[PDB]
Write an enzyme that holds these catalytic residues in place. Structure first.
Site, PDB file in Angstrom:
ATOM      1  N   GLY A  14       0.753  -1.238   0.000  1.00 60.95           N
ATOM      2  CA  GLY A  14       0.000   0.000   0.000  1.00 60.95           C
ATOM      3  C   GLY A  14       0.789   1.298   0.000  1.00 60.95           C
ATOM      4  N   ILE A  21      -0.005   5.693   4.674  1.00 53.69           N
ATOM      5  CA  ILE A  21      -0.026   4.952   5.933  1.00 53.69           C
ATOM      6  C   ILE A  21       0.956   3.771   5.920  1.00 53.69           C
ATOM      7  CG2 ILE A  21      -1.446   3.452   7.380  1.00 53.69           C
ATOM      8  CD1 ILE A  21      -3.798   5.354   6.749  1.00 53.69           C
ATOM      9  N   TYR A 156     -18.213   9.075   2.385  1.00 53.35           N
ATOM     10  CA  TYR A 156     -17.364   7.876   2.467  1.00 53.35           C
ATOM     11  C   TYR A 156     -17.950   6.758   1.612  1.00 53.35           C
ATOM     12  CZ  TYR A 156     -13.814   4.799   4.579  1.00 53.35           C
ATOM     13  OH  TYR A 156     -12.737   3.962   4.788  1.00 53.35           O
ATOM     14  N   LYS A 163     -15.183  -1.481   4.018  1.00 50.62           N
ATOM     15  CA  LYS A 163     -14.420  -1.549   5.257  1.00 50.62           C
ATOM     16  C   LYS A 163     -15.163  -2.393   6.281  1.00 50.62           C
ATOM     17  CE  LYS A 163     -10.672   1.065   4.651  1.00 50.62           C
ATOM     18  NZ  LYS A 163      -9.344   0.383   4.430  1.00 50.62           N
ATOM     19  N   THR A 194      -3.254  16.035   5.619  1.00 54.35           N
ATOM     20  CA  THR A 194      -2.645  16.090   4.280  1.00 54.35           C
ATOM     21  C   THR A 194      -3.025  14.875   3.442  1.00 54.35           C
ATOM     22  OG1 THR A 194      -0.860  17.539   5.095  1.00 54.35           O
ATOM     23  CG2 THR A 194      -0.656  16.652   2.865  1.00 54.35           C
ATOM     24  N   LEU A 195      -2.867  13.675   4.000  1.00 52.11           N
ATOM     25  CA  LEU A 195      -3.326  12.473   3.315  1.00 52.11           C
ATOM     26  C   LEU A 195      -4.842  12.498   3.106  1.00 52.11           C
ATOM     27  CD1 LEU A 195      -2.726   9.621   2.184  1.00 52.11           C
ATOM     28  CD2 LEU A 195      -2.908   8.744   4.527  1.00 52.11           C
ATOM     29  N   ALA A 196      -5.557  12.957   4.134  1.00 55.90           N
ATOM     30  CA  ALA A 196      -7.017  12.935   4.092  1.00 55.90           C
ATOM     31  C   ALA A 196      -7.519  13.787   2.936  1.00 55.90           C
ATOM     32  CB  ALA A 196      -7.606  13.416   5.423  1.00 55.90           C
TER      33      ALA A 196
END
Lengths: 258, 258
Positions: A14, A21, A156, A163, A194-196
């Site tokens: 990933g 992550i 989402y 998930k 930032t990733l979000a």
């Protein structure tokens, strides 16, 4: 200070860039002694991965499309060229059509639902069952999830049932493999700043809300997730399997803003 | 005497025979006053459904393959021929390859995972989003689930992530449509004696264990499920949406046998 994965080796899935992550996890696991192999989803990622992998003493990088069972077979054949056994696997693979992660859940397309299910959920089952064959003396694996699986996060959308299915599968796999002393757990991460923002249309708002309303008044860092992974993949968590473990700075426990 | 669905019209999905959960539900809702339409999958089911539907004063039977979006569009066109609106929808549709509902979960095939997901989970999204167009002043819908979604039941395998995804989608749909006063809930049923053994390899053992260890020392009946559906689909549950409601004679609350 901590060397509890000395002599251990494992697979990281990933990594897309240095904000992934999976990368934060890889850095922590290597710092604790682990040797790492990496999958990569495409060449543009592979180009970023090469210098990163070198900083953790690895040039073991293997292309893989986790939507394709034959590609995953090839991934493990490549691993076996160097390593007869594995000690851990990190599965941090979240995918859906981001253009559908906007507006109401009901507009989710059948095709996106299927692809999201295959990549974000079923790939963990595919990967686990291949990796378990390389764990004759047990081991540990984790996947990544998010609390949007069973509480409703705007936009989402398709990622939520995916998930939730992933969390369910984690428990069933923990039961399938516990007799082999393979532990299987999930980290339910909070949004990483930032990733979000890059990951979903309202990601910046999700991260800001989470920071403002979590008990600790901060978002989880890549390093926090990596440390929790180090716990779940080492002997420290010998008593823990099938756990959906929240590493979200406590956000999930808050009923409404103060 | 109960007549709280007087003047109401609804769609019942999932009747295969007179032991089907959907059928127990249909009988209770009709006894409370509802007019019913039924979907059916295939001609032998259709032949079984005709005399059953007649006993609840219906000849409104419409073929539908829930894997086929065109077929679901046609189902709703056929409803619109008689009815401008619907008051409720019952979704009691579950399928997985019985050959894979045994042995370890990890042996689940990709094709079975996908089909089980499309039939047992995504069909609810397909159906809800069509049905909402017939609920201009609100309404209520339910789906059926089982606690094997997030606690491990042997052999339940591919059905577990599918039901977990279904429970997730139930909550997301409840949020999508709540502004229109459409409520969306799930009944998490216990095993039903005899239906259980027919449905899965060790079904008799699951039912027997659940009966022996439930606080009430009995298994849930089709009528119990129907009465709970009546609650969730009538004005009585006006304050309830997104709920996964356990109708399992309390089995879920028990940590271990006495």
């Amino acid at each position: 200070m901590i060397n509890i994965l000395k002599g251990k080796r494992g697979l990281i899935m990933g990594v897309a860039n240095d904000h992934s992550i999976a990368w934060g996890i890889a850095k922590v696991l290597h710092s604790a002694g682990a040797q790492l192999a990496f999958s990569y989803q495409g060449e543009s990622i592979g180009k970023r991965l090469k210098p990163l992998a070198l900083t953790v003493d690895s040039d073991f990088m293997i292309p893989c499309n986790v939507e394709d069972p034959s590609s995953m077979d090839l991934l493990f054949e490549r691993i076996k060229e160097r390593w007869e056994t594995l000690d851990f696997v990190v599965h941090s693979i979240a995918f859906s059509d981001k253009n559908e992660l906007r507006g109401p859940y009901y507009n989710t397309s059948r095709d996106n639902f299927i692809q999201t299910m295959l990549v974000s959920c079923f790939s963990f089952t595919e990967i686990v069952r291949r990796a378990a064959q390389l764990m004759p003396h047990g081991g540990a694996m984790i996947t990544l999830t998010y609390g949007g699986s069973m509480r409703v996060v705007p936009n989402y959308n398709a990622m939520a049932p995916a998930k939730s299915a992933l969390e369910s599968s984690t428990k069933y796999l923990a039961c399938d493999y516990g007799g082999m002393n393979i532990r299987i757990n999930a980290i339910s991460a909070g949004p990483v700043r930032t990733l979000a923002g890059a990951s979903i249309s309202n990601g910046r708002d999700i991260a800001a809300w989470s920071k403002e309303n979590s008990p600790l008044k901060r978002t989880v860092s890549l390093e926090d997730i990596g440390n929790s992974a180090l716990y779940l993949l080492s002997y420290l968590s010998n008593g823990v399997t099938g756990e959906i473990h929240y590493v979200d700075c406590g956000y999930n426990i808050v009923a409404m803003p103060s």
